[PDB]
């Protein structure tokens, strides 16, 4: 039973690790959005 | 075993502390966005 308990421990440990990886991927995507709009307005500035 | 239990206690304690720090960083970034658009429209107002 306590081996099963440590199994749940490892389970939510790896689950929150994968949640951290999802957070990293979301941060990467939104950073891509940020520099994308940065160059958006970079070209808009020379147009202006 | 109960030492391991207190280990998980400290683990999720520090994990949610770091979650609080991530929340603080996100709040700081979005506050930067807020005052950025504030000065955006500050200059737009004198243009108008």
């Amino acid at each position: 039973s306590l081996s099963a308990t440590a199994s749940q421990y490892s389970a939510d440990k790896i689950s929150r690790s994968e949640a951290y990886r999802r957070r990293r991927q979301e941060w990467e995507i939104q950073r891509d959005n940020a520099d994308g709009e940065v160059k958006q307005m970079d070209a808009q500035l020379e147009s202006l | 075993s109960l030492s391991a239990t207190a280990s998980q206690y400290s683990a999720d304690k520090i994990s949610r502390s770091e979650a609080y720090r991530r929340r603080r960083q996100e709040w700081e970034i979005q506050r930067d966005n807020a005052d950025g658009e504030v000065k955006q429209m500050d200059a737009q107002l004198e243009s108008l």
């Binding site: - | 304690k13 502390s17 609080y20 603080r24 709040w27 700081e28 979005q30 506050r31 807020a34 005052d35 658009e37 504030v38 429209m41 500050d42 737009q44 107002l45 108008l48």
Partner: protein, 49 residues
């Protein structure tokens, strides 16, 4: 002349629009600043301790 007077009405209506834009945006600004600089409150440090 009446047309361009109406145009001046348009532009100063727009600048009033942007003035109350400032009102709303600055309200957001102080709300977010108050959230960030206060950060973590005594209840949360009590929970941590």
């Amino acid at each position: 002349i009446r047309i361009q007077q109406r145009t001046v009405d348009e532009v100063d209506a727009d600048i009033a629009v942007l003035a109350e834009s400032r009102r709303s945006a600055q309200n957001r600004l102080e709300k977010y600043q108050q959230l960030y600089d206060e950060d973590i409150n005594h209840g949360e440090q009590r929970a941590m301790s």
